[PDB]
Structure formats: C-alpha cells, structure tokens
Amino acid sequence: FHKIRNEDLIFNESLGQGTFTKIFKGVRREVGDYGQLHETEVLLKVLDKAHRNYSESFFEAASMMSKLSHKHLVLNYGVCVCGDENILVQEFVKFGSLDTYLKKNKNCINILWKLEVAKQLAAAMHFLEENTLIHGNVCAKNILLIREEDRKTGNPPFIKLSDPGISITVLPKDILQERIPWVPPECIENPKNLNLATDKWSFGTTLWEICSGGDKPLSALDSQRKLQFYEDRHQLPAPKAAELANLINNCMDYEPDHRPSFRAIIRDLNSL
C-alpha cells in the first residue's frame, strides 16, 4: 500500500463505524496527473487505537484485494500510518452502502434493478474466485453504489464490492456469532475453515438483503438463537419478492462443497 502523509488528509464528518473502526468522509491533497494539484474526496477508515493489535488483519485482505484491479472492486488509494494512526484511504463513493440505499429507496427498486446488482456482484465474485482470492465478508453493507439507475438514459445502477475489514479468522467468537447468517456454518464451527466456499454462502445472504429492502436476516434472533438456527439446519425465508429465492438457498448450502461456482451462479442469473 502507498503511504499517505497525515498532513495531506483532512478529516470531516463521521459516516458511522465498522468492527473496531470509525469511518469518516475526508479530503486528500495530492499531486495528480500532469502535476495538477487536487483536493480529492476520500473515505477514511480508522482502526480504533484500543484495537491496534488488529492492524495487520485490518490492512491484509484489503491489500491483497488491491493487488488486483477490477471495475467492480473498490479503489484503495493507500494507508496513513503516521503517528499512532492506522487509516485506510479509499475512494469516496457518492451513494454509500447498498443496505442503507435499499431501505431508503425500497419503493423505487424493482426486480430488474435487483437482478442487475446481483449480476454485478456475481461478476466481482467470479473474478475473485478465478484468482482464488477469498473476500471473507460479503454483505450489503460492503457493497457501494457508484451510480444510480437512470431509466431516461438506459443506464443501469453500478456497484463495487468494498474491503472485508478485519478477518473473521481473528475476530472474537461473539462477533462471529452476531454475524450469522453471513458467516457460514463451517466458520462458526471453526473460523479457520474460511475458504472460497465461504464467499458463496455469504453471497446468498447478500442476495437475500438485496431482495429484502435492506432488512437484516435473522435480526430478531439473539446470538444464542442464531447458533441454534445453524444447528437445526434452517434456511432463510424467501423474500416477499422471491425471484432469487432458489438461488439464495442454493448458495446457502450447509455442504460447502455443493455450493455452486460463480460461473454457474452467473448462468442462473442470466436465465432469469
């Protein structure tokens, strides 16, 4: 990761928090192409100082993801590790996270919009799978809406998959349990079971979010009941708009080896 000086960063408003992180809108002063000076809007992810021991995991998968370039993968500009800070400097996406967008615009999002977003996410995951790169935290909160749909000009929405944050292989067990049903059953059993098949399960959970107007699956269950949901081998309910329900359940297969390739997933989506 390219190193950015704290002096070139301005922190502005808080945009919320992730796991052991705080998120801010900011500005980066930089010299761009042709030597032109820019003041570039950025997204700043700050690891909590109290959790500095997660800094290696905080940067790792993000870095590996940034070693591959792809139109559906978020751009990381670099890191700021001046002083006692651990900061990821990321492109600022105009419309933010998909989960909030789905809820704010539920009445204005139809099946064709959901199908296009599902196809784009599948394309990103197929690219990762072909590169045998595990993401590890596929969820609607980690999908960013670059561009809104514009029916008047035929433009579909356009999304990017963002970074996974600190890996589930190092997070406390109580946090993994709260992340059911995004974290697959084999990873609740053993977080070291994280593998490519992990992302297929979470992708199914993410499709459920996309189809459920930003509802969170199993949000009414506490961690104990989320555990028993997996022990009883339950599946998620079909979303009211159930067009993707079979694909969701096919991806959320309790046998990791039976989860379909993203090539097959893309073929299924194209058939709808």
UniProtKB/Swiss-Prot annotation:
Residues under site feature: Breakpoint for translocation to form PCM1-JAK2 fusion protein: 174-175
Mutagenesis / variant outcome for changing residue 81 to F: In PV, THCYT3 and AML; risk factor for Budd-Chiari syndrome; somatic mutation in a high percentage of patients with essential thrombocythemia or myelofibrosis; leads to constitutive tyrosine phosphorylation activity that promotes cytokine hypersensitivity; no effect on its ability to up-regulate potassium voltage-gated channel activity of KCNA3
PTM description: Autophosphorylated, leading to regulate its activity. Also phosphorylated by TEC. Phosphorylated on tyrosine residues in response to interferon gamma signaling. Phosphorylated on tyrosine residues in response to a signaling cascade that is activated by increased cellular retinol.
Lineage top rank: taxon: Eukaryota
Residues found modified as Phosphotyrosine: 34
Subcellular location: Endomembrane system; Cytoplasm; Nucleus
Annotated tissue distribution: Ubiquitously expressed throughout most tissues.
Domain Protein kinase: residue ranges: 9-272
Subunit structure: Interacts with EPOR, LYN, SIRPA, SH2B1 and TEC. Interacts with IL23R. Interacts with SKB1. Interacts with STAM2. Interacts with IFNGR2 (via intracellular domain). Interacts with LEPR (Isoform B). Interacts with HSP90AB1; promotes functional activation in a heat shock-dependent manner. Interacts with STRA6. Interacts with RHEX; this interaction occurs in a erythropoietin (EPO)-dependent manner. Interacts with ASB2; the interaction targets JAK2 for Notch-induced proteasomal degradation. Interacts with MPL/TPOR.
Comment on protein domains: Possesses 2 protein kinase domains. The second one probably contains the catalytic domain, while the presence of slight differences suggest a different role for protein kinase 1.
UniProt function note: Non-receptor tyrosine kinase involved in various processes such as cell growth, development, differentiation or histone modifications. Mediates essential signaling events in both innate and adaptive immunity. In the cytoplasm, plays a pivotal role in signal transduction via its association with type I receptors such as growth hormone (GHR), prolactin (PRLR), leptin (LEPR), erythropoietin (EPOR), thrombopoietin receptor (MPL/TPOR); or type II receptors including IFN-alpha, IFN-beta, IFN-gamma and multiple interleukins.
Disease implication from the record: Chromosomal aberrations involving JAK2 are found in both chronic and acute forms of eosinophilic, lymphoblastic and myeloid leukemia. Translocation t(8;9)(p22;p24) with PCM1 links the protein kinase domain of JAK2 to the major portion of PCM1. Translocation t(9;12)(p24;p13) with ETV6. Budd-Chiari syndrome: A syndrome caused by obstruction of hepatic venous outflow involving either the hepatic veins or the terminal segment of the inferior vena cava. Obstructions are generally caused by thrombosis and lead to hepatic congestion and ischemic necrosis. Clinical manifestations observed in the majority of patients include hepatomegaly, right upper quadrant pain and abdominal ascites.
Family that this chain belongs to: Belongs to the protein kinase superfamily. Tyr protein kinase family. JAK subfamily.
Protein name: Tyrosine-protein kinase JAK2
Species per Swiss-Prot/TrEMBL record: Homo sapiens (Human)
Classification of source organism: Eukaryota, Metazoa, Chordata, Craniata, Vertebrata
Gene encoding the protein: JAK2
